[PDB]
Specification:
The complex is a heterotetramer, with two copies of chain A and two copies of chain C.
Chain A lengths: L2 H28 L2
Chain C lengths: L15 H18 L4 H11 L1 H32 E3 L7 H4 L17 E3 H5 L6 H28 L9 H8 L10 H17 L8 H16 L1 H5 L1 H20 L2 H12 L5 H21 L19 H31 L6 H16 L3 H4 L2 H9 L12 H5 L3 H22 L9 H25 L4 H6 L9 H17 L3 H11 L5 H17 L5 H9 L16 H4 L12 E2 L3 E2 H10 L4 E5 L7 E6 H14 L8 E3 L8 E2 L4 E2 L4 E3 L4 H11 L3 E6 L2 E7 H12 L1
Helix pairs in contact in C: 3-8, 3-9, 3-11, 3-13, 6-8, 6-15, 7-25, 8-9, 9-11, 11-12, 11-13, 12-13, 12-23, 14-19, 14-20, 14-22, 14-24, 14-25, 15-19, 17-20, 19-20, 20-22, 22-23, 22-24, 23-24, 27-28
Bound molecules: cholesterol (CLR) (4 copies) and chloride ion (4 copies).
Chain lengths: 32, 120, 706, 704
Amino acid sequence: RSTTTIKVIIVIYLSVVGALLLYMAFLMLVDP
Amino acid sequence: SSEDIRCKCICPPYRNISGHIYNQNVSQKDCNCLHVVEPMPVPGHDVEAYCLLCECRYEERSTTTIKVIIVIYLSVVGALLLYMAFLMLVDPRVEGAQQRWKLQVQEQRKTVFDRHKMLS
Amino acid sequence: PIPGVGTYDDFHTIDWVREKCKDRERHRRINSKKKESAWEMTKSLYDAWSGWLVVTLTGLASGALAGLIDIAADWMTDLKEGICLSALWYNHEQCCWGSNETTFEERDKCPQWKTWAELIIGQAEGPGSYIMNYIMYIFWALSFAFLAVSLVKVFAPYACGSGIPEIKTILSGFIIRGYLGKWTLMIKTITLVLAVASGLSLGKEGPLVHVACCCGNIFSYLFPKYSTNEAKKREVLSAASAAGVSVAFGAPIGGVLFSLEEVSYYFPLKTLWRSFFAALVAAFVLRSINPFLVLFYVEYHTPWYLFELFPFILLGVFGGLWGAFFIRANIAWCRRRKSTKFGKYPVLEVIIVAAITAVIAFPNPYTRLNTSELIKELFTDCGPLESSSLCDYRNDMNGVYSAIWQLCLALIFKIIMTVFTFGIKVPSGLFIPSMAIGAIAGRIVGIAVEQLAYYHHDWFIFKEWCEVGADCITPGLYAMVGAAACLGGVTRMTVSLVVIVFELTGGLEYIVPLMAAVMTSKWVGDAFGREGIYEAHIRLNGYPFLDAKEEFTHTTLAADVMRPRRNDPPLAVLTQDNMTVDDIENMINETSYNGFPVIMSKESQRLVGFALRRDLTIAIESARKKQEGIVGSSRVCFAQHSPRPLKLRSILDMSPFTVTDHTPMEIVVDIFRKLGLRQCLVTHNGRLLGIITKKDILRHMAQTAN
Amino acid sequence: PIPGVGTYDDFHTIDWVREKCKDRERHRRINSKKKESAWEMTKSLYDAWSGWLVVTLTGLASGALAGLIDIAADWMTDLKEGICLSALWYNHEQCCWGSNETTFEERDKCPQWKTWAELIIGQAEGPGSYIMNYIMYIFWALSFAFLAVSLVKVFAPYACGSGIPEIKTILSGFIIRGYLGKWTLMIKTITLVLAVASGLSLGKEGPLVHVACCCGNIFSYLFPKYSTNEAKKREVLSAASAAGVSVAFGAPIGGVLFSLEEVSYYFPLKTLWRSFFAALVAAFVLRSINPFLVLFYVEYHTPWYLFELFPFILLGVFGGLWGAFFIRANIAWCRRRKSTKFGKYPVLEVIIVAAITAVIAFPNPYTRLNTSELIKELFTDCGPLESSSLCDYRNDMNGVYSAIWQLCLALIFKIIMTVFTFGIKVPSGLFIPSMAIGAIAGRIVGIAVEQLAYYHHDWFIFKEWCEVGADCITPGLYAMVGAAACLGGVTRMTVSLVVIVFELTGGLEYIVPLMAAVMTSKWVGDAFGREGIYEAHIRLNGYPFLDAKEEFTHTTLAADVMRPRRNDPPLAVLTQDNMTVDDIENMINETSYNGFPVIMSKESQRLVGFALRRDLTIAIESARKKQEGIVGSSRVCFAQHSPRPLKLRSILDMSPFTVTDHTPMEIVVDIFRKLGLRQCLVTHNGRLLGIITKKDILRHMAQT
Ligand SMILES: CC(C)CCC[C@@H](C)[C@H]1CC[C@H]2[C@@H]3CC=C4C[C@@H](O)CC[C@]4(C)[C@H]3CC[C@]12C
Ligand SMILES: CC(C)CCC[C@@H](C)[C@H]1CC[C@H]2[C@@H]3CC=C4C[C@@H](O)CC[C@]4(C)[C@H]3CC[C@]12C
Ligand SMILES: CC(C)CCC[C@@H](C)[C@H]1CC[C@H]2[C@@H]3CC=C4C[C@@H](O)CC[C@]4(C)[C@H]3CC[C@]12C
Ligand SMILES: CC(C)CCC[C@@H](C)[C@H]1CC[C@H]2[C@@H]3CC=C4C[C@@H](O)CC[C@]4(C)[C@H]3CC[C@]12C
Ligand SMILES: [Cl-]
Ligand SMILES: [Cl-]
Ligand SMILES: [Cl-]
Ligand SMILES: [Cl-]
């Protein structure tokens, strides 16, 4: 099985999700 | 119908013995390596190896379909050739349709044979 | 309306807008009458199901005819080699079917089948036996070719050729009466088998499309909706072409894709599902009769590798090159047949070509073998059970040179023959010859690649992709790719071709290499010419075919293509009132214009409508018969309701299409292509100035191209 | 020309004719400049390869995104059941992939994977463990749904929904700026993964098409030809949709067929090959990434028999029925969301739906399992190796009733949930829900038919078709046929659907049963209504979409739909000469007309051209900036060449389409559909009389 492919996909998806949530939080609070 | 169905086993060359094909008219359950070939060249211990190398199939056909198709095609061709001879020799509402088709085929033959260039 | 109104002459394009409007009016009448009576409801239900019934009938007939043609062609082709005295209705394979004398070396070796040398000479082997087999092969080929050409001449001259070009023209709106008739169907069905048996470099796969179209036309005659309307009949013919491709290649999806891509000028959404249904029905029938699932099933155990793309692309290039060359050669040859006197002797031409093809075919095994059988053999993968000569070298080491030389000779022979064979006046196709040529080329390329891999496994690409001493290279896949490339180059078909090849193969793993090769072949052909063989033949025959590829110069204006121009006198016009029937009849006789504009007044030049010559003459004659006193003196009034004037507003298109003179002709061509306009009236300042006809557009396109 | 001329405002249709003319003018310019210099030749070569390059980029991006979304969704969905402590980055199957503790009874039973009860409760089995698993599953579903809806709302409102209807409108000339932007693409991918993880009755397969379309637009921005011209960009979007379907179902040919059949309003022949090539590229990338060649491969040893067609036809009917019901239910619910106050709280609706879905799904095995996984399990043929509960009855005698009851409960739950789950403000796809419903129904019917065959082999049909004591019936085939029937009934897709199913299952032999079932389902759906779910959603949203089915009344004529009519004042016209810039600007401000006709004189009403309002204002402002003294007093001359009058003939349409008033409106709809015209100027006796617009036709059709 291609362990590295799931590796990279899961890791980058989590990173992007975290970045999007951080941006949402900043817009909700920091931007005001 | 025995001629309609058979079972054939083709075996590629194995060790000393060269390849060989054995055919026999048997049912699918009877169709198998040990039944189609009797006896076999390879020894007993290598018999399984030879059968594994050998490939067996049960084949069936519809001879009636081929027979009827060939017969009807031949009948149509013969009738067409007889009508062609009629036109070439004998000719020199159904009758109205046939003469109308004679004029139409003359037109189409002039377009397709005499000129090859039909523009309109 | 008057009987016969709305009809078109032979070799006249149809006005899709008018035909559509007639269909809408007929639907109005049928739907309105439903509530009148239950029988009207049943008639309306039959009309609603008319499309489904016609596609089903077309599919059934196409499958039956395709199976009959295939079996008869196989038997007649095997007749040349010999005869089966025990069963004259059995071909060589079927005659040796139940034989127990078969050997591993020779699968079709049985005492039942007797070669002509055995029949006459009495010796199966020997110089005299070979001589007699040669002579009888030539004799049978000549007899079959002569029979085919004579049957075409006497009964159905239109039956000759693939018919795909003429089908494409017809679906665009062109009318060729008798092309899709009963006589053409029968004669083409018989002569396809005859020609395929003769051994000429032609195939029955393409012409099956025309056969299916004929069946579809005959079935459309049954249903009123599809008989009255030309556009509806053309939709049925598109479905019929899809079914024909399906039976030819056993590819329903590929059949629909081909019908959309090439033949169907207009493809409504419902035509898609109707065509798929017809193709499925026809394929089911063929499977019901023809077997006795995949015609060209292939089993390549090793999957295609990325580096193999490089050879495949090369095949693609070849598939383009030959393609272009053929399109340049055959057309030219065909053109000579129209200009020189060698085209004045068609039976002699077919007999001569059959003589030469048989003479050059008998000496070599691949050439002597039937083209479909050759394609199958070239597609098959080498194996220990297989006894094919192509793989002999692989058995010897793992004569390659001898096999490659034989394949190259067969390739040269087939390439040379196909140019002359296409254009000969018997049912012929390009699919099988092109596939055979491409398969031979691909087999040669695959043999070369396999030899390179085996001899030189030290190369990093070969070692990484293929294990040392492993037959990763499969000549059958290369042959398939070459056949696809050649067919794409000659036909310029990309998606329909790929899907048809995949269906005929039965394997989806090879979609990517096939697409790559087809794309390369199409690009190379376009570099050498953007017109396919079918389009080239349409242009050669000068049919009224309009294509989206063709376009006019930006300087071209509607005024430039206006019929009256300057030298031509003012275009014939019809006054709305104060005109005698004699005047209209004399105008109809004097001019060959498809139709005349009708204006309110001669001085005003204010267009009222457009009156077709056919409709005008039919209405005038019918009114003369119906009403007494119409000796031509009575006036004709086109305005809305002792002289008893004739009324021709009913036959008048009250909403003629109009463009302005300063409109670029590009927009006019776009309107004609999208709306299928037969003519458009160029008006200036609200008054008629001229007319642009699809014939005028085609003429100016030809002049620009010439 | 003036910069910005020919551009289109947001939520405005494009005129395909002007875009085509612009494309040809640009092509002529590039071809002429080729000979000027070698660099011009390289630019022209790049332009020629622009289509191939853009479709290649779209396919690559679609494949990569599809693989990423699929893997992330699988891992997140497995997150609800538990966590793999040994590997916080594997799903349940991957965690137990290498485990040596796996048993025949439980294939995914490994110690490395730990259910939330094990993490917290500490006992794998027991009432407390079951309760904690239940509550954690509900909590994870709620968290995923809430995060998806929050991301949709905050960043990309367009990310919500499948997007196929909006792509249909876009490919018909409509413009929705921002729908295919970077924000929409990113938010759509993330929220798709989150929503699929949440367990809601939705699928990512349909939305993958919109993801691909967004990628295609972004890549079209790279190539000047496709960016400048809207029709070229829409051709790229058709190729993108084909690639998206390909990645969604691994069906390249099916993807091209879907693109031609459903989304592409205009499908040029070249776009056929471009779409197929893009689909193959995207499928290749997905095969290179997602696997770790048929997603729903099936192995039905017994070929389908003729009598089995009758049950398949039945499935067809059912599909149709459900189809119609959904198109009557979902739309209504969606309409309620637009009319009532529960649409003002999309986040609350999403959270509530997720809560209900998880609560009812956990008790039953099929509903708890992922919808795609359930479809795959249903498609598999029962065999001795298989330990599926569905086949347990077959293992027993050869509890059928218990399995059928569980399947029926799953079917009912899915049918109810899909109605309230489609249209919510998160990415949702109908393909997977419809396929699951149809597959469950077909599995039930196939189990019933197998039971009939086994119990009653004396029947002549059963005995002739099937040997006594032989499992000729194949429940997987029936499930496949039912899924295809349901999808066809709900979507009214006939050929593209059949090819997509064939490529998704790799079974050509079962083409005929699928065709029959799809035809039957489509026909019953038509009996209940000719409009599919996507067309119904387009109509509900109010987008300006025109379809071949729509037609006008037969007494209607061009004069009836003419803009001026009687009550309305005469439609605004611009004098060719002796007309001021200030007056033109005042006319632009006064009316919201897309464009005004330009006549040579007011009295004559002789049409000279058609000048777009946007183009007119852009040209006036640009000329004011360029040339001094244009304070609005200077006159404007639309005729061909101290006041220094502004020249607006360049922005004027010299040859606008014109149709006589006596022309029936139905001829006009045929013209508009074929040529995709924005407006046609109805003129009587050579003088302008009125204007018909695509919006006028759409409004009058809607009223009818
Ligand atoms: C043009 C096509 C349709 C005609 C096909 C007719 C063929 C099959 C006919 C024509 C001549 C025939 C042969 C003529 C003579 C004999 C000798 C006899 O002792 C056995 C049959 C045999 C060998 C015939 C076999 C069939 C035959 C080859
Ligand atoms: C008016 C036209 C469309 C009618 C055409 C009907 C054709 C398609 C019909 C007539 C006779 C039929 C055949 C009759 C008998 C059998 C044997 C059965 O085991 C398989 C189907 C098969 C081989 C049928 C196939 C379809 C068939 C060839
Ligand atoms: C601008 C856009 C179009 C670029 C997108 C590039 C994408 C498609 C590229 C970037 C990284 C690539 C991957 C990198 C490595 C591997 C491992 C190899 O064994 C198979 C291919 C595979 C899995 C590649 C597939 C294609 C890939 C995902
Ligand atoms: C919305 C999505 C993207 C968020 C995904 C975050 C997931 C993966 C996080 C959130 C909470 C996390 C858990 C929190 C606490 C622990 C206890 C620790 O001893 C082992 C890991 C474990 C069990 C974590 C596993 C990963 C986890 C489940
Ligand atoms: Cl052919
Ligand atoms: Cl052909
Ligand atoms: Cl989905
Ligand atoms: Cl969807």
